[PDB]
Nucleic acid binder design. Structure first.
Lengths: 144, 185, 120, 260, 67
RNA sequence: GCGGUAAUUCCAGCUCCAAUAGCGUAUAUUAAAGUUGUUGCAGUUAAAAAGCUCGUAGUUGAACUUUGGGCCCGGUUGGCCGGUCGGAUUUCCAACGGGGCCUUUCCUUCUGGCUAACCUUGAGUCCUUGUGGCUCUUGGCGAACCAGGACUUUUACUUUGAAAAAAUUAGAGUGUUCAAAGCAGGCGUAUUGCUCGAAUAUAUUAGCAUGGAAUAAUAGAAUAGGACG
RNA sequence: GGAUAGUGGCCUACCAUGGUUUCAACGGGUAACGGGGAAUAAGGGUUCGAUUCCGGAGAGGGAGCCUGAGAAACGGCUACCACAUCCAAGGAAGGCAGCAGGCGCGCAAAUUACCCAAUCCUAAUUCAGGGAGGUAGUGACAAUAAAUAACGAUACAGGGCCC
């Protein structure tokens, strides 16, 4: 019984059956078609330098209400316009137009966080510093 | 290109990092024997795990084959010469019952305190790292020396090191010249 | 255990053994607890909960008024509430040795029975 | 890749040279010579790892250039000279005579002999063949070809050849029950007898070896090398006498001999 | 302390076999004043550029640079 | 999930916790993951038995063909052993196969090469009276080993051996002052030198020699064109 | 038969239609150099290996060829294509995926340093030369050894329980 062919010669049947049931794992097809180097906004990178176009009011999901103060950036290498979160308090006002910020992933591989809807990314630096340092006032920004 | 100098890490971090039991037990270890960072404890338990790994997978071999005989008697020889293993426990089962503090007992950190010399484990620590401790004729400044059998005889001070006579040092000298100028003339 | 006995007696107060885990790491309220609450439960009687004299409270009033602050400023100085500070002035309060220790470490005023009013 | 390697890095030389991993990239890369670069050892690692008569390649070059080192009797100034199996590296200065014979472990060690037996090296023959003007000739494993043999010699027979005469002396006809010196694989450097001999015609014929201490093994036949008669070898042998103790009794001999 | 030492018979043969930097360490040879290696390779390049004997060229280029 | 008026989650301070000359972050593979499952999943209803049969590949497939050694042991029939009023046993004891131990352990055979040792005698010498004792073969003994043959069903399987570059890895020796490391070093009689070392394991399918003949297929001799001679 | 170093459809004439494949051929992808190995590890495994060693392959793209034992060599030449330099505007020489260095590209990665002394190599050769290689600087990639204080002397408080 049990389904599988338990035969002492049945290994090609066994291995083909395994190889073709692997794709239903979310990650085997995701590497092996090549989907990061095809159509995720980054090319397998973790951070990308981008250019600020817009400041966006993304309003949070259902058990919350807040306007989240995100930013709408464009990549350098690839041209994608993409939302990005500007993290902790008051650091929207540290960013103006076209500020060449640095984008990271967000904590769940490439899905959203909590109650910003649809966003994948975040900013960590603006034009070559940081945001932690700027927020704790331990670094002052150069002026271009 | 000259070959890579091979190197390795010397410990394993624990797998569930916030367990109250592991915290309090390792805290009694560290605050008992004056251990600086838990890199020390995890290195000790790593050495214990390596010998425990070889002991399990060597004990699985049959009696009277020269691999088990050879590596077994040499392993017990090493533990005897370090001193964590008793003189009559020499069997491949008693080696796996070792706890961590049995390996902490043979640290020269502890051996200075056990032989006297300090009035504290912590004073032993500051004395070893300020280099007044010479095993025979070699100074150490390593608290985690993992001391051996015969040289526990030879734990004492140095031919330098003002505790071991021979030209007292800095603050004593400055106070000597200070009292000489302030009270002599 | 003779050698560490001498070591821990050479350190602060300790006991004849000192290896057992005291508990509640930021429960800073365990000054008065472990002997008195297990008295008042076991009593099955009525006990007298009393604060000492309002001279301590007027010492607080004099020291605060001399240091040019208010009650609320003193509460946000000692990380407690205005109500507990205000009752500690006006003598309708109950004691807490821990809070009295913060009042002394912020003011430098003896709040201790016989002697009142100097940073020791 | 366009032609012959002249470099050879460390971690690629044989292990019987026992070179440290560091203090260079490179390893002293034998020239062409009589003996293969797996089975030979250059004079530079011989002199500075195994005899300690120099610390520098500068020094080894001057030492050889002073024309004392008569490797098989002839003065050699070449640092990259592949000194290999059964080699009679002699001097005049220290008046010593080294013969490259192995260890029990498989390592070209030191074997200090007298002037007698510094005047003959042995050699396995590896093809005997007929050449110009009807002249037969016989090969060795340093490549010493010799014309006009004893026709009693066949292949896989060994020969005692002196230093300078050539002039084939006492050979040994190969058969069963003879002392041989197995010089390859894991049986490299052990000594035994020719208890049995087998022909797997077409590929890699073999020979059973029994040593003195009752340890049968079975070697291939390009690793065999006849050293002579039963209890009578034509040269001298190192410590251990090619016997390969077990590791536990090896440790036991080391520990017992350690101290008085 | 541990170092490694050499003693010699026949000091002439000693300085024969001796590394010359140690001879400079011992005052037995002059600390050689040679050019920096960049300067030496550059002069070497000029040397391999000038074919001939050099002054055969210097004469005619001085002749032509005169007028 | 907190945050919509007294926020144990925001911003600060106070205090603490942990890792500590390091801590956090992003992303990716690994463990967690018996959530890829051969070991090792699940399909009535949670996702999931093709509508149903046929059927080529693949995968799988009932039963059956005898066993050279002995020492010890126990188990069954049994006989001289029958005492007990047809059962009642011990063991001097065969074997009936069975469990360990050292080995019988082998390749089946000619073509003779060649015989180790003879059934001995070719007679008596050395020496205790002499089958003590050799120098020796004319009537015997081939496997102790060689190569021209024929034994020849082929494998899949498993045991053993040689290969399984150096580093790596597991690990043996060693106080690099501990150590990460390295392949060193250690002892004197330190004044004209002695010496151990630098192992071993592992690596796989694929080959290549080797034993094992259970398992699993495969050839025979039927319309005897059979082997024996 | 020629070619070749030499076998060979390697090529040519002639003569046959063969050879492979559902036990996956042929064609497509790849963020494919391979192997030694690395990580994680109960066991069975899964992913990775541009990279300190072996084997390969390439010198901007592509072919051809002298020299030579050995190169389809590019720190050699010739041709084209792509890219760019200096001129007196006639022309000439080009190759960093050697070593540093610069630009661009990027989340993204060092001195236009000293030297044959080590380890190796080359030659007519102990000697000359070696941006092979070694030596410092940058360097929180990693990995180890592990300073930030030790020994005292001190005091004030509560609050249980015996009185």
């Amino acid at each position: 019984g049990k389904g599988k062919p338990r035969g002492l010669n049945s290994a090609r049947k066994l291995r083909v059956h395994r190889r073709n049931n692997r794709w239903a794992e979310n990650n085997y097809k995701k590497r092996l078609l090549g989907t990061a180097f095809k159509s995720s906004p980054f090319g397998g990178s973790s951070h990308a330098k981008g250019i600020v176009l817009e400041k966006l009011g993304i309003e949070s999901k259902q058990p919350n209400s807040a306007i989240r103060k995100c930013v709408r950036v464009q990549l350098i290498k690839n041209g994608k316009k993409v939302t990005a979160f500007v993290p902790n308090d008051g650091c929207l006002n540290f960013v103006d137009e076209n500020d060449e910020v640095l984008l990271a992933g967000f904590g769940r591989k490439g899905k959203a966080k909590g109650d910003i809807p649809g966003v994948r990314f975040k900013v960590v630096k603006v034009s070559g510093v940081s945001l932690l340092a700027l927020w704790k006032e331990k670094k002052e920004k150069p002026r271009s | 290109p000259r070959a890579p100098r091979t190197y390795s890490k010397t410990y394993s971090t624990p797998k569930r990092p916030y367990e109250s039991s592991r915290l309090d037990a390792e805290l009694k270890l560290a605050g008992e024997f004056g251990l600086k960072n838990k890199k020390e404890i995890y290195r000790i338990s790593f050495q214990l795990s390596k010998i425990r790994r070889a002991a399990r997978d060597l004990l699985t071999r049959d009696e009277k084959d020269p691999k088990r005989l050879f590596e077994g008697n040499a392993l017990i020889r090493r533990l005897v010469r370090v001193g964590v293993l008793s003189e009559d426990k020499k069997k491949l089962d008693y080696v796996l019952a070792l706890k961590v503090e049995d390996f902490l007992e043979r640290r020269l950190q502890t051996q200075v305190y056990k032989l006297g010399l300090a009035k504290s484990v912590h004073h032993a620590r500051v004395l070893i790292t300020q280099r007044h401790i010479a095993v025979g004729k070699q100074i150490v400044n390593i608290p985690s020396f993992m001391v051996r059998l015969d040289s526990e005889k030879h734990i004492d001070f140095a031919p330098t090191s003002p505790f071991g006579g021979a030209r007292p040092g800095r603050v004593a000298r400055r106070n000597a010249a200070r009292k000489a100028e302030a009270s002599g003339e | 255990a003779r050698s560490q006995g001498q070591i821990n007696a050479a350190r602060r107060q300790g006991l004849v053994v000192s290896v057992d885990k005291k508990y509640g790491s930021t429960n800073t309220r365990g000054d008065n607890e472990g002997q008195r609450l297990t008295k008042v439960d076991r009593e099955t009687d009525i006990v007298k909960p009393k604060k000492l004299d309002p001279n301590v409270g007027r010492a607080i009033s004099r020291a605060r008024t001399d240091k040019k602050m208010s009650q609320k400023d003193l509460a946000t100085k000692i990380n407690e509430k205005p109500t507990v500070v205000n009752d500690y002035e006006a003598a309708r309060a109950i004691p807490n040795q821990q809070v009295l220790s913060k009042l002394e470490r912020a003011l430098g005023v003896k709040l201790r029975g016989n002697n009142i009013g100097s940073p020791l | 890749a366009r032609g012959p390697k002249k470099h050879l890095k460390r971690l690629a030389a044989p292990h019987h040279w026992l070179l440290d991993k560091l203090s260079g990239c490179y390893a002293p890369r034998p020239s062409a010579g009589p003996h293969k670069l797996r089975e030979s050892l250059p004079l530079i690692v011989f002199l500075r790892n195994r005899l300690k008569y120099a610390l520098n390649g500068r020094e080894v070059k001057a030492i050889l250039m002073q024309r004392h080192v008569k490797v098989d009797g002839k003065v050699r100034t070449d640092t990259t000279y592949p000194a290999g199996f059964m080699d009679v590296i002699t001097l005049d200065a220290t008046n010593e005579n080294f013969r490259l014979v192995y260890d029990v472990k498989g390592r070209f060690a030191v074997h200090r002999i007298t002037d007698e037996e510094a005047s003959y090296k042995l050699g396995k023959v590896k093809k005997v063949q007929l050449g110009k003007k009807g002249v037969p000739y016989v090969v060795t494993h340093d490549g010493r070809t010799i014309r006009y043999p004893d026709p009693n010699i066949k292949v896989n027979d060994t020969v005692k050849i002196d230093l300078a005469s050539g002039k084939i002396t006492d050979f040994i006809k190969f058969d069963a029950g003879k002392l041989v010196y197995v010089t390859g694989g894991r049986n490299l450097g052990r000594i035994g007898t020719i208890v049995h001999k087998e022909r797997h015609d077409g590929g890699f014929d073999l020979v059973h070896i029994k040593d003195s201490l009752d340890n049968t093994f079975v070697t291939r036949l390009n690793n065999v090398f006849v050293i002579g008669e039963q209890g009578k070898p034509y040269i001298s042998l190192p410590k251990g006498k090619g016997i390969k103790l077990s590791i536990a009794e090896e440790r036991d001999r080391r520990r017992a001999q350690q101290g008085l | 302390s541990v170092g490694f030492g050499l003693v010699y018979n026949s000091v002439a043969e000693a300085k024969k076999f001796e590394p010359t930097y140690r001879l400079v360490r011992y005052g037995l040879a002059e600390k050689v004043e040679k050019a920096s290696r960049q300067q030496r390779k550059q002069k070497k390049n000029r040397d391999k550029k000038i074919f001939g004997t050099g002054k055969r060229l210097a004469k005619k280029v001085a002749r032509r640079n005169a007028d």
